[PDB]
Amino acid sequence: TVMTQEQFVKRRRDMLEHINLAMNESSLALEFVSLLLSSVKESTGMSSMSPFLRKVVKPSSLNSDKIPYVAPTKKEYIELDILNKGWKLQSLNESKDLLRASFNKLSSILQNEHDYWNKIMQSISNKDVIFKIRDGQKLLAIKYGYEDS
Amino acid sequence: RRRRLKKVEEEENAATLQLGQEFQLKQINHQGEEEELIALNLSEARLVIKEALVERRRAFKRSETREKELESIDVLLEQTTGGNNKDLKNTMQYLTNFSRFRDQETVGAVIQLLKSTGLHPFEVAQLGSLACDTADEAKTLIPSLNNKISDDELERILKELSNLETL
Amino acid sequence: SFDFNGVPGQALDAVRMRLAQLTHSLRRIRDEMSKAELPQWYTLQSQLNVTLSQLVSVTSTLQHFQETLDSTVVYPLPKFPTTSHESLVTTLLRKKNIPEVDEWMKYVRETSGVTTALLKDEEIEKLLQQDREITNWARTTFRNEYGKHDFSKPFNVDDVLKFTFTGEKPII
Amino acid sequence: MFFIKDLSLNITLHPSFFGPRMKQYLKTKLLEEVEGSCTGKFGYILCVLDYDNIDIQRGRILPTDGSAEFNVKYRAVVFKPFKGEVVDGTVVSCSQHGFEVQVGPMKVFVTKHLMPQDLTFNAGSNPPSYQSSEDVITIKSRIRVKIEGCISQVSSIHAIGSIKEDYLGAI
Amino acid sequence: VTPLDELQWKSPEWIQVFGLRTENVLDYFAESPFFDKTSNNQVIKMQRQFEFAYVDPARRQILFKYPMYMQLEEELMKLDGTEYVLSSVREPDFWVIRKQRRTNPEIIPLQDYYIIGANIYQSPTIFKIVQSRLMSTSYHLNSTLESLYDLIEFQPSQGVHYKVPTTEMLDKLMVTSI
Amino acid sequence: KDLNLTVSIKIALMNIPKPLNSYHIKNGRIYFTVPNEFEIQLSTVNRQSPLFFVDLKLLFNTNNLPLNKPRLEKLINEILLKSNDPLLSLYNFLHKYVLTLQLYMVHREFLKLA
Amino acid sequence: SNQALYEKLEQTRTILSVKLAELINMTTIADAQENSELAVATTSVMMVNNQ
């Protein structure tokens, strides 16, 4: 396949926006758990706060109380189990597609490399001299000069 | 300044917090002021020395599992430190094997968790170094903890640190 | 008066630590990739792997402390400004997640091939039981297939030179 | 025990190193006999921290030697052992007198009188080890040892280890 | 369908007719679906329509501050079952109502319901809050990781890398010219 | 066109040197040119502020020579306002620079002669 | 150099020998333990994005 500059920058921007949303959700989760921490401790939770949040709301402003211990029902057990089976199946299908695409890429690359090596053998005799060289990639350079002859 | 012999002093004992006149809590830095004595736990020492080595590598250029980390720090030592590195290499493999915490986030948050104790830097460095599992075990391993920390606070700190240690 | 005894002590600050590590690593990803030039691929792969390990540590900590966290409900306090900053608190205790994750979750639900709306619950129970038996058979097939296979000096230079300079024969 | 300390060293530069970039020869010469050097006053010096700025002031020519004397002040990470401290390590050698455990950059010897009596030497084992009813002390084995006596010379530090206390021994 | 925790309930029609103050939160919460229609609170409400131990000081301030709640709890101690009391108040607009069963006395608390801006909310437990946040975080990192993988290109001559998308003497000239 | 009038009346209060009396007030600029050497075009924003760099075209034949656009723009804008009269200092510095890379090209020809 | 290839091939082989097997193995349903949707989601992302 072929991929372009505009496609590259589009993919970069969309993964950037997705990871922005990721850190936003994680940061609100952390900031919530530290806000609830500051009610009882006030020492360690204040470190992970935001200065704007401390400006707009004072700590120790949340509270929790214990509802009694409850045994979860079997209906949501089988709901979670069937959702687990669906998630596993979808992950397996995604893995299959990933492995097939990577195999196709690897097979094309290996065909090119094996053609290169067969050309090297049918091209280069042991009398010739070859050494690696950098640009910084590895290239095989043959010395055809007479300076050592 | 007085020229007294002052040859009488107590022996340097970690149990009695005596670490020598050159290891007091207040240390005079090169800029002049008194500053708190810096005691590093083993993970903290490994992170600090690794940061120093990568800083020296960057200066030279401009001028995670244990197996993949040992080779990386070894080639870093080879490309960074010259001769007489046998002691440094022994120290780096020692800090790799005895690494309670891997990344900087764990070590720094362990420091701010131990700063809530308000205890001596040496004993909290020992707590970050030694992997004690019970409060009385830490008390008999570190005699400075006797009549210094509450048993329940020590228990929750140790079991917290057990939760904090990774891999 | 106000009290804070319904709050968990070690579960909550432990998950605060783990989530703080996750956020810090996400920030490291951000200032690693916000530049116009990407870093070389091994470092970013290591960052991705350590973030995945951090999140699996997060869910291990949370799932190991499953109960006594279902049992603690959160409510705000009068010290919280609930008039000029109730928009702050309504997206602070929310458990209704973003529409993308649960539309994908419902898409996952219908692609499982079996549902609840037209099947009775014990049929689902026996289907999950036989699926678990199939997992057991597959993993013991993998186990027996894995267990079927296995997983200089000819002389002394100094003595020769002592011969050539003195005449003493090399003693053997 | 590991520490970060500000140290000052008197360094003599030979007059051959009085070049246009004398400071970098002086910094390297600071490096090879401080990195890994053992001093009894400050412990085994491990690494010289903060290389970019190091306090190199004006150096005095020795009146009869001709070498320049620089009192270089620097910050370095050290490892100074003390009595009554508990350090973990690995055994690197064993004998009938005892075994030596490597702690950081330094080796600590644990004598035959400082193991519990259930531990006894077994020279027939390859490598030779100390065997007990519940555990063995072999080479390349993690062991927790408390240092109860250490001697430091002007350039060498040696310590005595013991594992007879409870919650010590192999890890 | 949306279950009981992810919904904000309000009756601004009831606010227009009656209005909400520190006294009429009980029937306003009774209009809410969170209220138990078989609770002890509503049977004693129908009957009445037709210092003190085993309480925390937070409710004691409410009882000594407002009378109608203290004869409410004085009628509530006679009966047993699930009840509804207000643990804390903040005028002009903040309330909380806790599910609570009482036995003889022994009291356990249950799910609370905090009131903000005359809007009834179910107090959520924090496990599903952080679980929903982790749903968002995990789905977002899933999308980033899938969207990143298509740019990755492997060659055998080099390492694995990214897909490549499809004068130097002038500073010396500047420094020599001055 | 009123900016062309602006830069035309700006040089009314400016004395013009003999090597740079050839100018073309056009395209919102004034084209200070020296034949077969260079042509620099400049403009200003108002009366009391000095001019600023716009472009510079080399009139010598090697053209299409690469130029480091913002370092040269930086020191041109530096020597504009800090100088007592801008045009003479700009002419002197630009003449020095063009003769400098002409000498560099001559040295390149000398080293390629070997 | 040539010694490092030995243990490199050894470690690649010993993780290929068990990784697909453990991928199949950890998809186990029980009431390891997945008592919430979070464990299900993190397993179904970690398999694809980690194995």
Side-chain angles (χ1 to χ4, degrees):
Chain A
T1 181
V2 64
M3 81 76 68
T4 74
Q5 318 267 349
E6 58 89 20
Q7 187 177 118
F8 156 75
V9 71
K10 174 66 173 65
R11 267 155 183 164
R12 281 275 323 277
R13 292 291 92 79
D14 67 44
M15 65 183 73
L16 160 69
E17 187 51 50
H18 279 127
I19 201 58
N20 289 337
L21 292 178
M23 62 80 71
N24 284 321
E25 299 274 330
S26 73
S27 53
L28 279 71
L30 176 66
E31 185 177 2
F32 161 68
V33 75
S34 60
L35 275 172
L36 201 155
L37 193 149
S38 70
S39 71
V40 68
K41 283 293 206 315
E42 194 59 40
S43 52
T44 48
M46 282 311 323
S47 63
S48 63
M49 291 334 307
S50 164
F52 293 99
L53 193 72
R54 300 165 261 199
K55 152 193 168 181
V56 299
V57 60
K58 318 300 143 201
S60 298
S61 297
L62 266 70
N63 188 221
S64 182
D65 66 321
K66 305 282 307 191
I67 69 170
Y69 188 95
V70 64
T73 178
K74 268 76 183 173
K75 182 55 73 173
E76 65 89 20
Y77 282 163
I78 69 171
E79 176 263 330
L80 160 69
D81 286 336
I82 204 161
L83 195 42
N84 188 20
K85 166 171 173 296
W87 272 78
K88 292 309 169 37
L89 194 147
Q90 182 52 48
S91 67
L92 286 178
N93 188 23
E94 174 54 55
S95 70
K96 196 267 290 182
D97 279 331
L98 191 145
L99 292 199
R100 186 68 49 191
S102 57
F103 154 73
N104 293 336
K105 197 193 51 184
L106 279 190
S107 68
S108 65
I109 291 300
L110 277 187
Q111 182 53 48
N112 283 346
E113 165 185 5
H114 289 182
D115 287 323
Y116 177 45
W117 278 112
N118 294 9
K119 285 180 207 167
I120 279 179
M121 200 196 207
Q122 303 322 110
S123 82
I124 292 313
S125 71
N126 202 4
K127 211 71 175 297
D128 294 330
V129 56
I130 293 169
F131 51 93
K132 324 152 85 177
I133 208 167
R134 294 169 179 268
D135 296 1
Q137 58 177 313
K138 299 287 96 176
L139 290 178
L140 302 191
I142 179 168
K143 177 179 306 182
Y144 67 97
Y146 291 96
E147 61 86 20
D148 61 357
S149 292
Chain B
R1 190 183 62 86
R2 295 292 95 196
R3 298 312 303 281
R4 63 182 187 276
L5 306 184
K6 55 187 164 297
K7 61 188 61 185
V8 287
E9 70 260 11
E10 68 274 16
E11 192 187 1
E12 296 189 11
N13 181 206
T16 65
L17 278 301
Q18 174 79 358
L19 309 183
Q21 74 276 52
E22 59 87 20
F23 270 124
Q24 308 303 155
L25 175 62
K26 41 184 293 295
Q27 301 283 335
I28 294 93
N29 43 36
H30 287 329
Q31 52 262 25
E33 70 264 11
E34 308 95 3
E35 191 273 330
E36 191 170 1
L37 175 59
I38 303 109
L40 307 184
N41 57 86
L42 267 51
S43 299
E44 188 174 2
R46 188 182 57 83
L47 272 296
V48 175
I49 299 174
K50 203 176 69 176
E51 282 295 324
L53 288 184
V54 300
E55 196 259 343
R56 288 229 285 265
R57 164 219 47 84
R58 180 186 293 109
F60 168 70
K61 193 69 64 181
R62 79 166 186 261
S63 291
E64 49 263 11
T65 182
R66 276 188 169 100
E67 304 297 321
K68 86 182 187 64
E69 199 70 32
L70 189 50
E71 42 194 24
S72 67
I73 66 159
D74 183 73
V75 65
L76 179 60
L77 282 160
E78 293 285 343
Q79 84 189 2
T80 311
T81 76
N84 200 0
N85 45 10
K86 178 190 300 179
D87 274 330
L88 194 43
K89 282 177 185 304
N90 294 323
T91 312
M92 295 299 102
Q93 64 93 32
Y94 172 83
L95 293 175
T96 300
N97 302 354
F98 303 94
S99 177
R100 311 260 315 272
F101 320 108
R102 297 289 205 269
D103 62 358
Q104 183 62 255
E105 286 85 19
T106 48
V107 182
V110 159
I111 300 299
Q112 63 84 30
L113 191 150
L114 293 165
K115 89 179 178 181
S116 54
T117 69
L119 263 67
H120 199 278
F122 175 77
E123 54 195 351
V124 300
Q126 286 277 352
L127 275 164
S129 166
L130 308 180
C132 313
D133 300 340
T134 316
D136 56 354
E137 168 199 16
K139 288 268 192 166
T140 187
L141 279 174
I142 317 166
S144 76
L145 302 185
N146 289 334
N147 296 115
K148 185 57 172 299
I149 193 66
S150 300
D151 62 358
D152 62 358
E153 291 163 348
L154 192 62
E155 276 284 340
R156 65 178 293 276
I157 281 157
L158 266 67
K159 71 187 185 187
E160 198 162 359
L161 284 183
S162 76
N163 307 138
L164 308 195
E165 180 178 355
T166 182
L167 307 182
Chain C
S1 63
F2 296 99
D3 181 23
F4 302 106
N5 295 353
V7 295
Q10 273 214 9
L12 191 150
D13 63 358
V15 73
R16 181 216 55 95
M17 180 145 197
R18 284 317 179 181
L19 185 48
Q21 300 166 358
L22 190 137
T23 54
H24 206 120
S25 300
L26 284 187
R27 267 205 314 114
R28 295 283 75 78
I29 297 169
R30 188 65 41 77
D31 55 14
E32 197 72 28
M33 69 69 63
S34 66
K35 316 147 51 172
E37 201 263 343
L38 271 299
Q40 69 95 25
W41 175 234
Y42 293 99
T43 61
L44 195 150
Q45 257 182 342
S46 62
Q47 293 164 258
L48 291 190
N49 286 119
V50 300
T51 48
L52 288 174
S53 69
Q54 279 189 343
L55 191 146
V56 73
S57 72
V58 165
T59 178
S60 68
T61 305
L62 200 64
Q63 208 272 346
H64 186 273
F65 291 162
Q66 171 76 41
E67 279 155 341
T68 70
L69 275 296
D70 303 348
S71 82
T72 68
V73 293
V74 54
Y75 53 93
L77 288 173
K79 325 158 191 47
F80 200 103
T82 61
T83 66
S84 163
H85 300 88
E86 68 179 3
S87 68
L88 182 72
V89 66
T90 182
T91 176
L92 183 63
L93 323 173
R94 40 161 303 183
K95 72 157 290 306
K96 176 189 185 57
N97 62 7
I98 62 180
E100 298 157 328
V101 56
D102 43 7
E103 63 86 20
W104 196 81
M105 182 145 38
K106 295 302 117 180
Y107 182 76
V108 159
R109 190 85 82 156
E110 54 96 12
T111 51
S112 179
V114 62
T115 49
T116 302
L118 73 164
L119 276 78
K120 189 268 183 181
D121 62 358
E122 288 298 322
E123 275 79 359
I124 318 294
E125 197 270 336
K126 65 96 176 179
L127 190 149
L128 270 295
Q129 177 57 256
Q130 67 94 46
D131 192 283
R132 170 198 291 107
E133 292 303 317
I134 290 177
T135 62
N136 206 321
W137 167 86
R139 66 182 180 179
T140 198
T141 293
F142 270 93
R143 181 186 283 100
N144 58 60
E145 191 52 56
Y146 154 77
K148 167 191 307 303
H149 312 258
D150 168 85
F151 288 114
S152 298
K153 289 319 184 65
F155 44 80
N156 190 13
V157 173
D158 296 329
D159 202 356
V160 165
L161 280 174
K162 192 166 66 178
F163 160 73
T164 59
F165 280 94
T166 73
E168 278 192 345
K169 296 296 296 293
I171 177 64
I172 293 296
Chain D
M1 187 66 204
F2 297 95
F3 292 96
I4 296 183
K5 186 179 289 293
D6 284 310
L7 306 178
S8 63
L9 190 72
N10 285 283
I11 314 184
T12 61
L13 269 178
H14 197 269
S16 312
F17 310 102
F18 288 175
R21 47 185 66 256
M22 164 168 77
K23 290 184 182 301
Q24 65 86 29
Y25 313 87
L26 189 47
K27 279 196 299 296
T28 51
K29 195 172 185 302
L30 161 69
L31 289 184
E32 70 274 15
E33 69 275 16
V34 172
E35 299 271 332
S37 75
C38 172
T39 61
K41 200 173 300 179
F42 305 105
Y44 293 80
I45 299 169
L46 295 174
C47 169
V48 171
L49 322 169
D50 167 357
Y51 183 100
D52 65 0
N53 73 277
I54 310 184
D55 186 74
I56 290 174
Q57 66 273 17
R58 205 191 281 309
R60 185 181 81 102
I61 307 296
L62 296 184
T64 180
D65 189 359
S67 47
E69 180 38 81
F70 296 87
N71 174 60
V72 167
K73 298 158 72 176
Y74 62 99
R75 185 180 280 285
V77 64
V78 309
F79 179 76
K80 174 65 172 301
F82 307 100
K83 94 182 292 178
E85 79 182 7
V86 171
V87 295
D88 303 335
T90 63
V91 187
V92 296
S93 66
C94 178
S95 62
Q96 54 89 28
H97 282 317
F99 65 98
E100 289 87 358
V101 59
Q102 168 82 16
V103 287
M106 171 205 188
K107 334 174 76 173
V108 167
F109 179 69
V110 191
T111 74
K112 49 193 170 308
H113 314 92
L114 295 166
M115 283 74 74
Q117 286 85 5
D118 56 350
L119 280 151
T120 180
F121 190 41
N122 190 6
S125 52
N126 290 318
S129 304
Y130 277 92
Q131 271 79 356
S132 67
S133 61
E134 70 270 15
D135 52 28
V136 296
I137 304 184
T138 186
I139 320 292
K140 301 298 295 176
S141 55
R142 318 283 208 85
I143 181 165
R144 171 186 316 269
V145 58
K146 186 252 291 179
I147 296 183
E148 70 275 357
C150 60
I151 176 167
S152 60
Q153 299 285 342
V154 75
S155 63
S156 66
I157 305 186
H158 301 261
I160 307 298
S162 68
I163 55 165
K164 287 194 64 167
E165 200 65 38
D166 202 73
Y167 300 120
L168 275 73
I171 322 178
Chain E
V1 60
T2 300
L4 210 63
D5 189 76
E6 310 86 336
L7 60 94
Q8 62 183 357
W9 188 90
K10 62 183 180 295
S11 279
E13 293 189 331
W14 183 95
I15 297 168
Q16 287 286 319
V17 173
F18 295 88
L20 184 63
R21 299 158 320 277
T22 182
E23 301 181 58
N24 46 1
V25 288
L26 287 180
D27 62 358
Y28 189 37
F29 182 79
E31 280 191 340
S32 186
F34 306 135
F35 195 83
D36 283 334
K37 263 73 193 179
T38 76
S39 175
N40 183 34
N41 190 247
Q42 63 85 29
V43 300
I44 69 149
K45 183 185 312 177
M46 292 180 183
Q47 295 294 321
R48 297 282 85 78
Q49 176 193 351
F50 185 38
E51 193 69 31
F52 294 112
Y54 55 84
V55 292
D56 62 357
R59 279 171 59 205
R60 258 191 287 253
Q61 301 153 317
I62 307 301
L63 294 186
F64 303 147
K65 204 188 312 171
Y66 297 115
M68 73 291 291
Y69 299 126
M70 62 79 71
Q71 69 273 16
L72 181 68
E73 64 95 22
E74 272 287 328
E75 295 293 327
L76 278 163
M77 32 175 78
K78 309 305 185 307
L79 272 298
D80 291 331
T82 178
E83 312 168 354
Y84 294 94
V85 293
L86 185 143
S87 69
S88 180
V89 66
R90 173 204 159 178
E91 298 205 13
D93 44 353
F94 172 74
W95 299 271
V96 64
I97 298 104
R98 38 182 282 174
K99 299 261 193 180
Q100 167 170 347
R101 185 177 65 247
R102 178 178 302 174
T103 44
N104 309 315
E106 199 266 326
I107 284 171
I108 62 170
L110 283 72
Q111 166 170 85
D112 294 12
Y113 299 96
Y114 68 98
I115 316 298
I116 51 170
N119 205 325
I120 307 194
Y121 285 72
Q122 182 155 295
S123 300
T125 186
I126 64 175
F127 176 80
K128 276 74 70 177
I129 308 172
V130 292
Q131 157 189 325
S132 72
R133 298 310 210 282
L134 285 179
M135 294 298 102
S136 289
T137 305
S138 67
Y139 170 77
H140 286 324
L141 62 93
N142 204 327
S143 49
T144 63
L145 261 64
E146 297 158 303
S147 43
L148 167 64
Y149 291 156
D150 63 358
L151 323 171
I152 307 307
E153 169 170 283
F154 171 71
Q155 289 184 358
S157 58
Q158 311 150 353
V160 63
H161 61 106
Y162 303 94
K163 290 182 180 179
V164 169
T166 78
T167 310
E168 65 273 345
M169 73 291 291
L170 269 294
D171 43 26
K172 298 291 180 68
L173 284 169
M174 295 298 102
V175 71
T176 46
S177 177
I178 301 299
Chain F
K1 72 165 181 283
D2 61 52
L3 188 50
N4 274 113
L5 188 151
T6 285
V7 301
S8 176
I9 68 177
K10 167 78 168 186
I11 75 157
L13 296 169
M14 186 66 204
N15 72 356
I16 190 76
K18 306 303 187 180
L20 274 183
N21 47 26
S22 61
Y23 43 75
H24 201 41
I25 304 104
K26 206 183 176 289
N27 302 320
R29 287 148 264 166
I30 180 168
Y31 289 16
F32 295 121
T33 178
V34 180
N36 220 330
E37 203 166 351
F38 51 82
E39 166 196 298
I40 183 167
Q41 329 177 347
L42 296 185
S43 277
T44 188
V45 287
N46 56 352
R47 198 63 46 231
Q48 295 91 344
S49 313
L51 290 91
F52 53 90
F53 166 77
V54 185
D55 48 338
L56 160 69
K57 175 64 165 60
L58 272 300
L59 264 69
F60 84 106
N61 196 3
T62 188
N63 200 1
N64 321 315
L65 268 298
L67 316 175
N68 45 0
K69 272 307 179 299
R71 269 81 60 195
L72 66 90
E73 175 172 271
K74 160 201 60 66
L75 74 164
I76 277 168
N77 288 34
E78 279 285 331
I79 65 172
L80 273 157
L81 58 94
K82 300 193 325 292
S83 62
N84 51 1
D85 60 311
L87 297 196
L88 269 297
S89 166
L90 285 153
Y91 160 69
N92 297 322
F93 159 73
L94 187 47
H95 162 93
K96 165 142 198 193
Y97 167 57
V98 298
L99 268 66
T100 297
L101 74 164
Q102 276 187 26
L103 291 178
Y104 185 77
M105 202 95 87
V106 163
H107 177 90
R108 191 63 173 179
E109 297 280 329
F110 285 165
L111 67 94
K112 96 165 189 69
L113 189 140
Chain G
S1 67
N2 63 6
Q3 312 333 319
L5 315 172
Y6 272 103
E7 74 254 11
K8 193 181 293 182
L9 161 67
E10 173 53 57
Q11 63 84 29
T12 50
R13 156 190 190 162
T14 194
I15 62 171
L16 291 173
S17 57
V18 291
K19 194 142 80 82
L20 172 64
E22 68 94 19
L23 182 149
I24 300 305
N25 180 37
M26 51 66 78
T27 72
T28 292
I29 297 169
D31 297 75
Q33 189 59 254
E34 302 156 302
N35 293 321
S36 68
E37 208 53 58
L38 166 66
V40 166
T42 186
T43 45
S44 296
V45 65
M46 72 66 68
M47 293 183 286
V48 161
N49 284 347
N50 190 359
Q51 266 74 17

